[PDB]
Amino acid sequence: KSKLPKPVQDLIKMIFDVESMKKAMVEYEIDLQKMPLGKLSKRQIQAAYSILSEVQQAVSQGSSDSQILDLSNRFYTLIPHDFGMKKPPLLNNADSVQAKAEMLDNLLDIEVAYSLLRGGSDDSSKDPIDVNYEKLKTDIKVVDRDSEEAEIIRKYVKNTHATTHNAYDLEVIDIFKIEREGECQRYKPFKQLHNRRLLWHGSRTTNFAGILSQGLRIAPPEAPVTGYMFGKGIYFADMVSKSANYCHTSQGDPIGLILLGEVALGNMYELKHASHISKLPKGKHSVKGLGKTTPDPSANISLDGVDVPLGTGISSGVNDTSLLYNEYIVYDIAQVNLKYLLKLKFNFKT
Ligand SMILES: C[C@H](NC(=O)CN1CCc2cccc3c2[C@@H]1CNC3=O)C(=O)N1CC=C(c2ccc(F)cc2)CC1
């Protein structure tokens, strides 16, 4: 019978929920019959990634228009879809592969979750909830609702909700202090690096077994580049709202998980438009996508040598940028130390 607190157990249940994995594969219009979660293999997901890479290649660099067809065919063969009577869309443009790349990105973390979940031995003195918690290799302490942390974190949530993301409201349900096994040592060199900021990373609940057990990761070479305004990196926002939208919560499932991450931003390569450099200029350690609105500098609180940008949104200088709001990207997974995981309730508009 579990030691773990009520909120933590609920979290463990939530991220190891086989049904949410299933639901999300359905949303992506995968064929569950030809492919169950058990069959979901790491090998094909990486193989299917390579096929995605063979497309995008060709297309505007080659393009046989019948080899493209065989490729699209090798894809849905590998990852069986179920459009029913409609046939799958041929993978013949960038926008087309972005969508299927993003999906593999999720199946990857889903495979991680289910692998984790159905792995291990049942010594069974401790109930599965204890077991599954230990599979995450992360310490998770509940942050007291009435503390100073909790109030700053809630202020960060309240103040940085964007003017144009008003399709819902955010209520913090639980706040977790998190410590990934080994991440301190990993982050250790970047701790001396200046300009360190507590920033938002939103993702779907089905990625958290993966995110907690392995950290925020970077897309490998086998993957495309489309949609990536600043390359293959780990992205963050200073507005809870920019990040929440990537939880992919609906009126039907209104509860989301978001991360607070300390990120060692160093000298930021400040940008206004999508240049895929990926290789920074020397003495630059991150990219900051400049936006029209920014959190308010006069309120950037500092704790334990780390900037919390809980200024409410005001006019940034920036003129002639495509960016909604700011956006921070690093290209080395070690520049990130996860600090908090928040259970968010999305209270949907009207
Ligand atoms: C590029 C991709 N980004 C996204 O899916 C969405 N994000 C980009 C835009 C953005 C901007 C500001 C804040 C956020 C984002 C989001 C992620 N959530 C953030 O709050 C990404 O960084 N991933 C991390 C790990 C990827 C990966 C894929 C394959 C693999 F083998 C290893 C890692 C999958 C997705």
From Swiss-Prot:
It comes from the Eukaryota. Residues 127-350 form the PARP catalytic domain. Changing residue 209 to S/L: Increased DNA-independent poly-ADP-ribosyltransferase activity. NAD(+) binds at residues 201-203, 210, 217, 243. Residues 1-118 form the PARP alpha-helical domain. Changing residue 165 to E: Decreased polymerase activity, leading to the production of short poly-ADP-ribose chains. There is a cross-link at residue 87 (Glycyl lysine isopeptide (Lys-Gly) (interchain with G-Cter in SUMO2)). Changing residue 232 to I: Abolishes enzymatic activity. This is Poly [ADP-ribose] polymerase 1, processed C-terminus. It comes from Homo sapiens. The chain holds residues 662 to 1011 of 1014 of the full protein.
